[PDB]
Amino acid sequence: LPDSVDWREKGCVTEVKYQGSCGACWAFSAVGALEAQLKLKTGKLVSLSAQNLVDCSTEKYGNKGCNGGFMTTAFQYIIDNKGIDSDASYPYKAMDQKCQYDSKYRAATCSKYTELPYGREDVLKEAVANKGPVSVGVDARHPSFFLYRSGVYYEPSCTQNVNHGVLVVGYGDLNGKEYWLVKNSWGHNFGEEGYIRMARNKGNHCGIASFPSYPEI
């Protein structure tokens, strides 16, 4: 496997989004992963509708819109629904709404998704290198995460109890300090212009490899 990977260099990552006061991190993580597969399949980079997931991948998928959800069940909704609309056609409003999905605005489909084995950072590395960005849950419930500005994030009090959905779009090292390159959905003012480099091969730091999954088309 390559020592470092950055899917942004491969044109498979869209602009960083701002979820606002709506807890739709799970929806942003899911569309983010599917956006890369869509680019790999069609050659086009298009932001997909996180709102579509918030409003439609609801109770039947164990999700609660702005109150939380799962990337895996979000992928299953897209599969069952036979599509997800473009973000342009179904914009994000940072609030729960009645489902407004319309197949006339479909921008992607999904045929399946894969959940990686719990806590295996080596397996996660292989997936990021060979398949594409991977949706993951992390424990972001610590002040240091909110205050992160730059460098490799390491929090001694981090746990494997995850609560925030994000997207691993690469991996590498900062002068030896290995990290996972993570796209967040807290806007471009968060961390490294929307990204955070989280400690890699540090005993499943913040549970980054606890629940990884990626979709395919």
Q: Which stretch binds ligand BLN (CB under 6 A): 74-82, 95-103, 158-166, 167-175?
A: 158-166
Closest CA to 186 of 19, 49, 63: 19
Q: Check if 164 is active-site.
A: yes
Among the listed residues 22, 63, 164, 206, the single catalytic one is 164
What Rg, from alpha-carbon coordinates, does the chain have? 16
- Letters for 163-182 (x = contact with ligand BLN by CB under 6 A, - = none) are xxx-----------------
Q: Can you point out the beta strands (E) in the chain?
A: 5-6, 84-85, 106-108, 112-115, 134-138, 152-153, 164-174, 177-183, 195-199, 213-216
The residue length of the chain stands at 217
Q: Check if 188 is active-site.
A: no
CB of 205 to ligand BLN, least distance (A): 15
The reply on whether position 188 binds ligand BLN by CB under 6 A is no
Q: Which amino acid is residue 171, in one-letter code?
A: Y
Of residues 196 through 215, those in contact with ligand BLN by CB under 6 A are: none
Closest CA to 52 of 121, 100, 107: 100
The reply on whether position 134 binds ligand BLN by CB under 6 A is no
The reply on whether position 96 binds ligand BLN by CB under 6 A is no
Question: Which positions lie near ligand BLN, rule CB under 6 A?
Answer: 23-26, 62-64, 67-70, 137, 140-141, 162-165
